[PDB]
Design an enzyme around this catalytic site. Structure first.
Site, PDB file in Angstrom:
ATOM      1  CG  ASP D  94      -1.924   1.164   1.266  1.00 46.68           C
ATOM      2  OD1 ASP D  94      -3.132   0.996   0.859  1.00 46.68           O
ATOM      3  OD2 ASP D  94      -1.479   2.264   1.711  1.00 46.68           O
ATOM      4  CG  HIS D  95       2.910   2.354   3.404  1.00 45.39           C
ATOM      5  ND1 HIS D  95       3.398   2.366   4.689  1.00 45.39           N
ATOM      6  CD2 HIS D  95       1.586   2.623   3.506  1.00 45.39           C
ATOM      7  CE1 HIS D  95       2.415   2.634   5.538  1.00 45.39           C
ATOM      8  NE2 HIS D  95       1.299   2.797   4.841  1.00 45.39           N
ATOM      9  CG  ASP D  96       5.909   0.075  -4.251  1.00 48.64           C
ATOM     10  OD1 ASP D  96       6.472  -1.057  -4.388  1.00 48.64           O
ATOM     11  OD2 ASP D  96       6.205   1.080  -4.972  1.00 48.64           O
TER      12      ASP D  96
HETATM   13  C1  HEM Z   1       0.303  -1.513  11.386  1.00 51.58           C
HETATM   14  C2  HEM Z   1      -0.958  -1.555  10.667  1.00 51.58           C
HETATM   15  C3  HEM Z   1      -1.593  -0.450  10.089  1.00 51.58           C
HETATM   16  C4  HEM Z   1      -1.777   0.787  10.616  1.00 51.58           C
HETATM   17  C5  HEM Z   1      -1.415   1.239  12.028  1.00 51.58           C
HETATM   18  C6  HEM Z   1      -2.487   1.565   9.616  1.00 51.58           C
HETATM   19  C7  HEM Z   1      -2.882   2.887   9.788  1.00 51.58           C
HETATM   20  C8  HEM Z   1      -3.544   3.641   8.848  1.00 51.58           C
HETATM   21  C9  HEM Z   1      -3.846   5.040   9.011  1.00 51.58           C
HETATM   22  C10 HEM Z   1      -3.638   5.869  10.268  1.00 51.58           C
HETATM   23  C11 HEM Z   1      -4.357   5.464   7.826  1.00 51.58           C
HETATM   24  C12 HEM Z   1      -5.020   6.823   7.509  1.00 51.58           C
HETATM   25  C13 HEM Z   1      -6.329   6.978   8.270  1.00 51.58           C
HETATM   26  C14 HEM Z   1      -7.069   8.232   7.947  1.00 51.58           C
HETATM   27  O1  HEM Z   1      -7.575   8.325   6.811  1.00 51.58           O
HETATM   28  O2  HEM Z   1      -7.160   9.120   8.822  1.00 51.58           O
HETATM   29  C15 HEM Z   1      -4.321   4.328   6.953  1.00 51.58           C
HETATM   30  C16 HEM Z   1      -4.512   4.428   5.597  1.00 51.58           C
HETATM   31  C17 HEM Z   1      -4.372   3.417   4.706  1.00 51.58           C
HETATM   32  N1  HEM Z   1      -4.143   2.111   5.058  1.00 51.58           N
HETATM   33 FE1  HEM Z   1      -3.811   1.358   6.863  1.00 51.58          FE
HETATM   34  N2  HEM Z   1      -2.752   0.822   8.469  1.00 51.58           N
HETATM   35  C18 HEM Z   1      -2.221  -0.419   8.770  1.00 51.58           C
HETATM   36  C19 HEM Z   1      -2.321  -1.514   7.943  1.00 51.58           C
HETATM   37  C20 HEM Z   1      -2.896  -1.515   6.687  1.00 51.58           C
HETATM   38  C21 HEM Z   1      -2.914  -2.664   5.805  1.00 51.58           C
HETATM   39  C22 HEM Z   1      -2.689  -4.127   6.244  1.00 51.58           C
HETATM   40  C23 HEM Z   1      -3.359  -2.197   4.588  1.00 51.58           C
HETATM   41  C24 HEM Z   1      -3.493  -2.871   3.381  1.00 51.58           C
HETATM   42  C25 HEM Z   1      -3.581  -4.298   3.261  1.00 51.58           C
HETATM   43  C26 HEM Z   1      -3.642  -0.796   4.776  1.00 51.58           C
HETATM   44  C27 HEM Z   1      -3.968   0.076   3.739  1.00 51.58           C
HETATM   45  C28 HEM Z   1      -4.153   1.443   3.862  1.00 51.58           C
HETATM   46  C29 HEM Z   1      -4.325   2.353   2.737  1.00 51.58           C
HETATM   47  C30 HEM Z   1      -4.288   1.966   1.237  1.00 51.58           C
HETATM   48  C31 HEM Z   1      -4.438   3.603   3.275  1.00 51.58           C
HETATM   49  C32 HEM Z   1      -4.397   4.956   2.535  1.00 51.58           C
HETATM   50  C33 HEM Z   1      -2.950   5.441   2.240  1.00 51.58           C
HETATM   51  C34 HEM Z   1      -2.869   6.833   1.581  1.00 51.58           C
HETATM   52  O3  HEM Z   1      -2.557   7.838   2.293  1.00 51.58           O
HETATM   53  O4  HEM Z   1      -3.108   6.931   0.346  1.00 51.58           O
HETATM   54  N3  HEM Z   1      -3.391  -0.386   6.068  1.00 51.58           N
HETATM   55  N4  HEM Z   1      -3.878   3.198   7.585  1.00 51.58           N
HETATM   56 BR   LIG Z   2       0.425   3.773   8.144  1.00 57.02          BR
HETATM   57 CA   LIG Z   3       5.472   3.131  -6.278  1.00 51.99          CA
END
Ligand code: HEM
Ligand SMILES: [Br-]
Ligand SMILES: [Ca+2]
Ligand SMILES: *[C@@H]1O[C@H](CO[C@@H]2O[C@@H](C)[C@@H](O)[C@@H](O)[C@@H]2O)[C@@H](O[C@@H]2O[C@H](CO)[C@@H](O[C@@H]3O[C@H](CO[C@H]4O[C@H](CO)[C@@H](O)[C@H](O)[C@@H]4O)[C@@H](O)[C@H](O[C@H]4O[C@H](CO)[C@@H](O)[C@H](O)[C@@H]4O)[C@@H]3O)[C@H](O)[C@H]2NC(C)=O)[C@H](O)[C@H]1NC(C)=O
Ligand SMILES: *[C@@H]1O[C@H](CO[C@@H]2O[C@@H](C)[C@@H](O)[C@@H](O)[C@@H]2O)[C@@H](O[C@@H]2O[C@H](CO)[C@@H](O[C@@H]3O[C@H](CO[C@H]4O[C@H](CO)[C@@H](O)[C@H](O)[C@@H]4O)[C@@H](O)[C@H](O[C@H]4O[C@H](CO)[C@@H](O)[C@H](O)[C@@H]4O)[C@@H]3O)[C@H](O)[C@H]2NC(C)=O)[C@H](O)[C@H]1NC(C)=O
Ligand code: HEM
Ligand SMILES: *[C@@H]1O[C@H](CO)[C@@H](O)[C@H](O)[C@H]1NC(C)=O
Ligand SMILES: *[C@@H]1O[C@H](CO)[C@@H](O)[C@H](O)[C@H]1NC(C)=O
Ligand SMILES: *[C@@H]1O[C@H](CO)[C@@H](O)[C@H](O)[C@H]1NC(C)=O
Ligand SMILES: *[C@@H]1O[C@H](CO)[C@@H](O)[C@H](O)[C@H]1NC(C)=O
Ligand SMILES: [Br-]
Ligand SMILES: [Br-]
Ligand SMILES: [Br-]
Ligand SMILES: [Br-]
Ligand SMILES: [Br-]
Ligand SMILES: [Br-]
Ligand SMILES: [Br-]
Ligand SMILES: [Ca+2]
Lengths: 466, 104, 466, 104
Positions: D94-96
């Site tokens: 997701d971070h890529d």
């Molecule tokens: C260690 C596990 C994970 C988190 C802790 C975590 C946290 C977040 C947060 C705080 C956000 C933003 C919330 C908001 O909109 O205020 C968030 C965004 C996204 N996640 Fe999270 N995440 C953890 C783990 C996952 C996993 C397992 C994911 C995918 C299989 C996953 C995805 C996403 C995505 C795509 C976003 C948006 C990213 C962006 O800024 O474009 N997360 N997560």
């Molecule tokens: Br995160």
């Molecule tokens: Ca990328």
């Protein structure tokens, strides 16, 4: 930098440079004036530049009523409760109403005849005076609105001004939709493209994006290929109406004085009906009246409309010919031979190849108007795909489409099914002989003409509120 | 957007209740394809000298018009099955659909 | 202002309102902190607001290398020509590289343990320290880059820093694509949705839009339902790493100090391999560790990740459940009964309707994770469609896709086909026993494990320049 | 965009030659469907007191979370067929792909 008076390339000017041995402009220090279209997001180092549509996308006669509240207000007669559009308070066309004058800072219409002192007309859209034939159509619809409003005041006494205006506005919009999808579009696209891109209407679909696509603004300019080098005017028996029955188009642009001082809209509408459109051929694309002399009387140099279209498509960041073919699910020619096959014209493919190097870079208007026309249609496959796709969206994604359940009653739709452009002309002009339906096909008098008396006028009985 | 209405707004706003600006005036056109600019985001092809498009020199708009569009008016072919009203309705209709503003 | 410290709803804040009688936030006038995503076109009265992707959309391991040049350069070791990534100059993990520390203005990692004074890590992506398990994966790939660069340096002695870096970076990117498409996505989508949205790669298609869609940023958050309430640490025999083998998630967010001072990345990585993920179920969607106590150590109160996902979808102007179902060509439930049928759970549909009123208004994340999981998949039809469509574009629309003609040699592609996450862990850590492929399925020690010694190394022979 | 290149750029720029910003960093997301805002162009649903979304009150995200997402921790069900690594790769991937910036 003044885009109208300088050839310097700096924001927001994108002047067309002049090639060597140009047929008209031998001075390569000169140029064709061009202002870049306003960016939706000025100065952004984030967004991909886009352009703006200043009008409503809907087929709602916004060129009559306007697309902004101030304007729509200023276009109304707010001196009584009749719900009418304001008319000209200084001139009439043999007893009938003209469009009101506009107040323009650098009025181009005045420059078409300094003696006359006749400014540009004020309408729903800002281009109503661009040619007298267009001005005549605006004038027609203006009159029809008032007529409807008048009859409507008769059927329903209680209806106030606002009600009259809106109900009349609603019928005019339906008329524009009906003339457009019933009579116009089928002859644009042809049988096959009409079936394909505009299947039978079902009902309003709120997921259908009704916005105009950037590409449509350029593709629909296909009409430039239909323009005759003259404005034709005829008398009540459809004979050349002297002393100037065939004026060069380069002396009619913004010439509002011709409508006011030279006979009104009747001679103009007759010319439109009894004169053939120019046909688009692969080596007869567009006449010099617009390719060499567009707006000659109202600026420092004559413009080139086809050239402007290609410059504009680049200004708008529009993809080339092959990207649009792909989008439309049409094969993408890569060699001059392939292009020749798609165009059924090796000579044209060669010319395009020598200019562009690759069919990937052919500008959309040029490529589009270059394709051989579909049977009983006036555009090729590409433009047909682009125009047909656009109109299906404008139809299906319009909550106020005339056939949408709830807009009009079943008996009101029956009444509107009897409207026609010929009929509208009969109701708001001195002309008593009009083209037989379809008006866009009929073009030979007296063979394709009939008296108005044989054509039933819109029956508004089903608008009775009682 | 009003829960109920009787007619179109003048701007087109609220025709589409879920996305109120769709079809309304003074709004960016929709892109059916990603835009293609010389710098990828704002400059038109042909802006910078020497900069090609997709492997080839940008042709001057005026040159293409001169070479392909130009034709002797006496060759003009009247369309036996279309009236000039066909052209005119087209322009009128185009003016109900789009107007692309430019700076004064 | 500071959206983190007040409940005032003014730009750029959009604080979440609290429902009456909330089980935690008892003062009904207070709120949950929320900052609106930056608009692509600030203060525009023309553009439809949109949000920005600060990262490269491509699967190119940008979370490692950076998506901006100045950062990219700052992640690189420029103290020599070894083409390496910079490593931490203060600490080592049992003689192995850690990520360097970052230089933040209000470093949240500092707050997780005040006496330890360990700041957040500096990486390709700004969220590397969000949880130690994430940090561990970041560290793993950093090591893999330096490992590959070193091996390539021995094979290609004339290759300078830039060349080694680029070649190593290219391999790392290829690895991420392979693990993602071969091992990961099949277990997300299920076999059926995988064949549907991810048909056999044919070749790069320059007309395929590779951008991330706005809705994907919200829909891919399905993974939040997979989160266990603890960080599991295991020793070298896969037993509990005392004294604290199960740390509540609320005390590991931004807890970089645990990586540096509590055993490094080995116990963490073993923990990830030998513990099951949480299964998403319709009455077991997401745990309170993230629903009540998200980021508790670095915020004024605990946040709610599920609720943030829904607020975010609104902030981004995303259509509701049925519009996304329509987009995906799936039946659109209009009544509780119909929703009951689609979800195979009338109780759940009932709860959704009591909260939302209509299925048209259900937020995409909520609707998405509510759907019954596809066979052998971890998402329902809606999320399957959205995610599958996004990854297809990322593959087909990427000119540097590892399988695209001209990127890698045939010999290189064959070598790359032998890579695996278990082997990468073996190559860069002190762990000698790892998961059996598929690493994403395997989750039980010793059953699903084998010795690193039974796994061949990546053969770099075909990278040797002849 | 250069004629040829052996490596990706850092920003993603020029991956797509015809439209070089596609997939590149610091660009707006592509819309697969028209945005749905309270005022049609920018205010999110839940912004204005009393403003309904398509005939029904906007449900508080925290209320939805409380009534539908909340569940007893001891009821958590271990996924017999997935490792925690399945969760972790997701976040790493997701971070890529995407990071939506917010003002500090
Ligand atoms: C260690 C596990 C994970 C988190 C802790 C975590 C946290 C977040 C947060 C705080 C956000 C933003 C919330 C908001 O909109 O205020 C968030 C965004 C996204 N996640 Fe999270 N995440 C953890 C783990 C996952 C996993 C397992 C994911 C995918 C299989 C996953 C995805 C996403 C995505 C795509 C976003 C948006 C990213 C962006 O800024 O474009 N997360 N997560
Ligand atoms: Br995160
Ligand atoms: Ca990328
Ligand atoms: C390279 O990829 C191109 C993109 O392909 C998409 O993404 C990849 C990853 C796959 O998932 C693929 O399946 C996707 O389509 C691809 O070009 C695409 O090709 C299709 C098929 O020809 C085109 O679809 C046609 O579109 C036109 C225009 O309307 C479309 O766009 C408007 C505006 O968004 C929408 O409102 C419409 O609903 C359409 O989406 C249609 O006229 C046409 O339909 C008509 O014809 C068919 C056949 O007779 C009938 O079934 C219909 O009823 C209509 O009569 C198609 O829908 C698509 O526009 C085009 N996209 C682009 C960006 O060019 C290309 O083929 C790929 N090349 C290779 C070698 O892989
Ligand atoms: C109301 O109108 C809606 C819009 O309809 C379009 O415009 C009108 C004017 C008509 O011309 C119509 O023909 C046009 O489609 C309409 O919703 C539309 O419904 C279609 C069909 O269900 C949807 O297409 C499906 O799309 C998904 C998602 O991918 C699409 O989007 C991506 C990214 O944006 C593109 O890259 C893709 O190329 C697609 O365009 C696809 O997954 C799906 O294809 C798959 O499924 C089929 C069937 O199994 C397989 O054959 C394929 O190989 C794939 O596996 C479809 O392409 C379309 O997204 C949707 N649009 C909207 C806005 O929701 C709605 O149904 C109409 N309702 C009524 C009552 O008329
Ligand atoms: C009396 C005949 C017509 C003209 C005179 C005329 C003129 C123009 C001009 C000056 C433009 C702008 C050129 C530029 O890019 O600088 C233009 C734009 C468009 N047209 Fe033209 N046009 C005449 C007639 C037609 C007909 C018959 C058309 C359709 C069948 C037609 C279409 C268009 C379109 C769609 C545009 C773009 C409008 C916008 O601003 O969005 N024209 N035309
Ligand atoms: C308004 O209507 C009245 C009655 O038809 C007419 O006398 C007057 O001229 C109209 N005003 C304008 C500005 O058209
Ligand atoms: C200009 O209009 C006047 C009326 O003021 C008319 O007499 C004259 O013929 C027109 N001039 C031209 C060049 O047509
Ligand atoms: C760069 O690499 C050299 C050798 O690997 C090492 O001495 C030095 O610590 C590295 N510098 C950084 C900042 O990682
Ligand atoms: C904080 O870090 C120190 C090491 O600096 C460690 O000894 C201590 O136990 C940590 N505190 C907590 C609550 O974990
Ligand atoms: Br007047
Ligand atoms: Br015009
Ligand atoms: Br007559
Ligand atoms: Br477009
Ligand atoms: Br450091
Ligand atoms: Br081990
Ligand atoms: Br979207
Ligand atoms: Ca309109």
């Amino acid at each position: 930098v003044n885009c109208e008076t300088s050839c310097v390339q700096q924001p927001p000017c994108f002047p067309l440079k002049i090639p060597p041995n140009d047929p008209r402009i031998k001075n390569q220090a000169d140029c064709i004036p061009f202002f870049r279209s306003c960016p939706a997001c000025p100065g952004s180092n984030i967004t991909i530049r886009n352009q703006i549509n200043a009008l409503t996308s809907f087929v709602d006669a916004s060129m009559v009523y306007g697309s902004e509240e101030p304007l729509a207000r200023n276009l109304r007669n707010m001196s009584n409760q009749l719900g009418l559009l304001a008319v000209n308070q200084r001139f009439q066309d043999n007893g009938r109403a003209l469009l009101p004058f506009d107040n323009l800072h650098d009025d181009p219409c005045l420059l078409t005849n300094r003696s006359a002192r006749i400014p540009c007309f004020l309408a729903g859209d800002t281009r109503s005076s661009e040619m007298p034939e267009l001005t005549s159509m605006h004038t027609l619809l203006l009159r029809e609105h008032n007529r409807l409003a008048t009859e409507l005041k008769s059927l329903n006494p209680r209806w106030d001004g606002e009600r009259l205006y809106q109900e009349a506005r609603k019928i005019v919009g339906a008329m524009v939709q009906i003339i457009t999808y019933r009579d116009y579009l089928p002859l644009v696209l042809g049988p096959t493209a009409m079936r394909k891109y505009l299947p039978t209407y079902r009902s309003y679909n709120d997921s259908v994006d009704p916005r105009i696509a950037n590409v449509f603004t350029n593709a629909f300019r296909y009409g430039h290929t239909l323009i005759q080098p003259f404005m034709f005017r005829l008398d009540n028996r459809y004979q050349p109406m002297e002393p100037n029955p065939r004026v060069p188009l380069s002396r009619v642009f913004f010439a509002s004085w011709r409508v006011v001082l030279e006979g009104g809209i009747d001679p103009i509408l007759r010319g439109l009906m009894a004169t053939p459109a120019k046909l688009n051929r692969q080596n007869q694309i567009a006449v010099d009246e617009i390719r060499e002399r567009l707006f000659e009387q109202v600026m420092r140099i004559g413009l080139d409309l086809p050239a402007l279209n290609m410059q504009r498509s680049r200004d708008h960041g529009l993809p080339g010919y092959n990207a649009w073919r792909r989008f439309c699910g049409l094969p993408q020619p890569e060699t001059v031979g392939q292009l020749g096959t798609v165009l059924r014209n090796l000579k044209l493919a060669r010319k395009l190849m020598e200019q562009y190097g690759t069919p990937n870079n052919i500008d959309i208007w040029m490529g589009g108007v270059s394709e051989p026309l579909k049977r009983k249609g006036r555009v090729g496959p590409l433009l047909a795909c682009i125009i047909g796709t656009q109109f299906r969206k404008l139809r299906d994604g319009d909550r106020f489409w005339w056939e949408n359940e709830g807009v009009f009653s079943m008996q009101q739709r029956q009444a509107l099914a009897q409207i026609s452009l010929p009929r509208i002309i009969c109701d708001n002009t001195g002309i008593t002989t009009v083209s037989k339906n379809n008006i866009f096909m009929s073009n030979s008098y007296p063979r394709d003409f009939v008296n108005c008396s044989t054509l039933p006028a819109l029956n508004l009985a089903s608008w009775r509120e009682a | 957007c009003p829960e109920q209405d009787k007619y179109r707004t003048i701007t087109g706003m609220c025709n589409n209740r879920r996305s109120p600006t769709l079809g309304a005036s003074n709004r960016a056109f929709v892109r059916w394809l990603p835009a293609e600019y010389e710098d990828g985001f704002s400059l038109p092809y042909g802006w910078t000298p020497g900069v090609k498009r997709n492997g080839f020199p940008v042709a001057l708009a005026r040159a293409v018009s001169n070479e392909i569009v130009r034709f002797p008016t006496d060759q003009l072919t009247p369309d036996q099955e279309r009236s000039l009203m066909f052209m005119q309705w087209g322009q009128l209709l185009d003016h109900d659909l789009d107007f692309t503003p430019e700076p004064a």
